[PDB]
Amino acid sequence: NYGRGRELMYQLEKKGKEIKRDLEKILLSGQARTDVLADQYLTNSAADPA
Amino acid sequence: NPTLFVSYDQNGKKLSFANWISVLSPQDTPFVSMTGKESINQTIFSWQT
């Protein structure tokens, strides 16, 4: 290509910018954690089969 | 030969002329002179956004 450079690196850097924007938006919007741990955040508590 | 010192004693004067021209109205355009021009040889140019 002439300005596109190529099809891989250009697309990758564009997607990097896009994910950066999405990350900033998701961080600044406001949302509480929802991971299912049920008070086992600390006390590593291996996955507890079943 | 200083003889009269009125009008013709010192001939070959500069006629009260100076080597600088005064354009009474401002007609300069610093905008283009600031924005530098770039050369292009070919005619298949292309730019990216």
Side-chain angles (χ1 to χ4, degrees), chain A residues 16-32:
Chain A
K17 298 172 221 177
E18 285 185 342
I19 182 167
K20 190 76 78 174
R21 297 195 315 174
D22 275 7
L23 182 147
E24 196 192 10
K25 168 55 185 301
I26 295 288
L27 291 185
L28 291 168
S29 42
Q31 64 188 22

Side-chain angles (χ1 to χ4, degrees), chain B residues 33-48:
Chain B
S33 306
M34 178 196 69
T35 51
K37 63 195 175 64
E38 76 295 3
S39 296
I40 193 78
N41 175 237
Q42 310 155 351
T43 187
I44 49 175
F45 62 89
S46 301
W47 77 86
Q48 44 186 359

Side-chain angles (χ1 to χ4, degrees), chain B residues 5-20:
Chain B
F5 187 64
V6 165
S7 298
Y8 275 87
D9 204 330
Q10 173 184 4
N11 204 322
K13 305 179 185 299
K14 72 155 190 271
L15 317 180
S16 308
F17 270 134
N19 53 8
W20 75 293

Side-chain angles (χ1 to χ4, degrees), chain A residues 3-5 9 11 13 17 22 25-26 30-31 36 39 41 48:
Chain A
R4 274 72 63 87
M9 301 185 295
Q11 286 286 88
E13 87 196 15
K17 298 172 221 177
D22 275 7
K25 168 55 185 301
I26 295 288
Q31 64 188 22
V36 289
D39 198 74
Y41 307 87
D48 181 67

